[PDB]
Amino acid sequence: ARVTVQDAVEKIGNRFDLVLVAARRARQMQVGGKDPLVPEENDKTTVIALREIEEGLINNQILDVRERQEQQEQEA
Amino acid sequence: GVLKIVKVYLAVKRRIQPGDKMAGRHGNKGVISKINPIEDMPYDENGTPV
Amino acid sequence: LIEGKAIQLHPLVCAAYNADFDGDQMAVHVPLTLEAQLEARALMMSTNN
Amino acid sequence: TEFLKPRLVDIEQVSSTHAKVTLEPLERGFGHTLGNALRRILLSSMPGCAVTEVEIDGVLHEYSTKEGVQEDILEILLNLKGLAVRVQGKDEVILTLNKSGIGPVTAADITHDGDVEIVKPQHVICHLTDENASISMRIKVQRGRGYVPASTRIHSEEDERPIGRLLVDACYSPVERIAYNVEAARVEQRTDLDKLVIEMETNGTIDPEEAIRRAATILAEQLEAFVDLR
Amino acid sequence: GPEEITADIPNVGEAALSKLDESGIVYIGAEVTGGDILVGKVTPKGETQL
RNA sequence: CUCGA
Ligand SMILES: [Mg+2]
Numbered sequence: 001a002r003v004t005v006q007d008a009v010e011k012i013g014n015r016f017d018l019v020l021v022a023a024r025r026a027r028q029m030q031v032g033g034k035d036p037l038v039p040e041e042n043d044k045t046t047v048i049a050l051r052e053i054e055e056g057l058i059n060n061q062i063l064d065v066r067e068r069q070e071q072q073e074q075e076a
Numbered sequence: 077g078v079l080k081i082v083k084v085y086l087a088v089k090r091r092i093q094p095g096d097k098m099a100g101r102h103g104n105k106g107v108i109s110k111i112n113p114i115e116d117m118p119y120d121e122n123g124t125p126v
Numbered sequence: 127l128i129e130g131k132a133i134q135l136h137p138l139v140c141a142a143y144n145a146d147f148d149g150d151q152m153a154v155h156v157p158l159t160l161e162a163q164l165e166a167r168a169l170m171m172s173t174n175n
Numbered sequence: 176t177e178f179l180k181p182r183l184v185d186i187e188q189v190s191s192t193h194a195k196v197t198l199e200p201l202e203r204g205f206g207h208t209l210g211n212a213l214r215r216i217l218l219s220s221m222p223g224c225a226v227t228e229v230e231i232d233g234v235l236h237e238y239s240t241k242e243g244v245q246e247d248i249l250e251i252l253l254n255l256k257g258l259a260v261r262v263q264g265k266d267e268v269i270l271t272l273n274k275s276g277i278g279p280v281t282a283a284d285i286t287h288d289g290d291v292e293i294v295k296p297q298h299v300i301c302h303l304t305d306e307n308a309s310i311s312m313r314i315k316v317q318r319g320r321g322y323v324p325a326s327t328r329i330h331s332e333e334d335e336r337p338i339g340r341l342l343v344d345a346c347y348s349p350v351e352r353i354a355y356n357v358e359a360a361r362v363e364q365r366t367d368l369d370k371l372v373i374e375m376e377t378n379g380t381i382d383p384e385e386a387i388r389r390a391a392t393i394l395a396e397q398l399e400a401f402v403d404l405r
Numbered sequence: 406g407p408e409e410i411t412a413d414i415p416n417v418g419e420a421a422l423s424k425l426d427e428s429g430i431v432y433i434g435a436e437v438t439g440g441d442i443l444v445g446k447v448t449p450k451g452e453t454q455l
Numbered sequence: 456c457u458c459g460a
Pocket residue numbers: 145146147148149150460
């Protein structure tokens with residue numbers, strides 16, 4: 001997902017949701033400190049998010065569940 | 077309101093680079109794109125490069 | 127990154143720009159944030175247009 | 176069907192510069208492969224000598240003039256780039272020029288040592304017009320390869336050089352232009368063999384028996400990374 | 406107070422004052438680059454809070 | 456105002 005973003009946009013559904021989802025995910029690795037799932041292979045934090053999206057590992061429902069469970073874990 | 081004025085005259089020498097506008101006399105403009113080596117230019121059967 | 131003082135452009139995008147190489151000039155704008163950097167890869171990259 | 180190998184067979188001197196070297200014999204394909212892989216190296220990288228720094232006394236920069244000479248000092252720097260010297264023993268020499276009196280200043284008036292030899296003594300450097308006027312300079316000659324401009328040398332130095340030591344652009348390569356021709360070789364039974372007539376043209380600071388040996392030493396060194404290491 | 410052209414310059418070492426002469430103006434024929442100081446001129450500053 | 460696309 002470096003040259004073109006045709007693989008990623010056919011999973012989320014439209015470009016304007018893909019941009020917001022990848023911008024939300026790409027900030028959890030910038031300052032939040034959460035670790036990436038795909039191997040990095042020397043890339044910035046934008047293309048790692050755009051590659052996590054295109055392999056079905058990051059969505060909007062997954063990004064909501066994965067932080068609500070950790071907010072409940074912060075409650076405990 | 078001025079005490080003294082100094083004036084300094086530099087002398088810049090400039091070669092050609094990729095970007096310098098060159099043009100003929102018949103209205104064919106141009107931007108220089110690449111400065112090849114001498115041996116890459118097309119040469120005729122007497123040895124002179126172009 | 128090339129040495130020199132001239133923005134080197136791809137020869138196929140000149141139909142979109144209407145740019146003839148006879149002394150044209152082009153402006154270079156950088157996106158700063160992390161949202162704008164993702165709006166230049168998925169919305170405005172030249173392989174999408 | 177084993178092979179046949181070429182050899183440096185004939186060398187003749189048309190003039191002090193123009194030469195014509197033939198190679199014989201070759202097979203069909205290699206007559207046009209070596210003839211193009213010996214032009215692309217003899218034009219690019221051949222070691223020669225050239226003038227680098229000129230220091231004329233009394234003059235600060237290159238954009239002024241001196242009394243009693245016809246040209247500007249910048250025209251003298253443009254004249255001193257086309258000087259064909261040949262340094263044998265050392266790797267860097269300094270030559271002196273002294274002249275006084277009405278007349279031109281040829282390149283033969285340089286008080287040379289035993290090793291350097293100005294090969295074209297009829298070159299023209301200056302023009303003196305007054306009797307009282309004189310000129311005196313010291314000229315540095317180095318050994319190099321390719322083309323090294325003045326901005327690279329002033330950027331890649333760090334000691335403070337004194338005001339007055341002008342810098343000249345240095346073009347080091349001796350070969351001016353070179354062509355080659357492939358004719359049918361004269362072999363009695365292997366009829367389709369070729370010969371290769373490399374037609375060289377330079378200035379007098381190179382030897383055509385040595386230039387092809389350097390240009391084939393380089394080619395047999397660069398192919399040494401292909402023959403064993405994969 | 407008036408301004409002055411001095412060879413003394415604050416917060417600048419010897420590496421830029423090599424081409425400035427006794428009086429503070431650059432020598433004729435000195436090869437300069439981008440950023441080097443040609444005329445050393447200092448100006449008085451009214452005192453500020455810190 | 457003059458010049459460049
Ligand atoms: Mg145009």
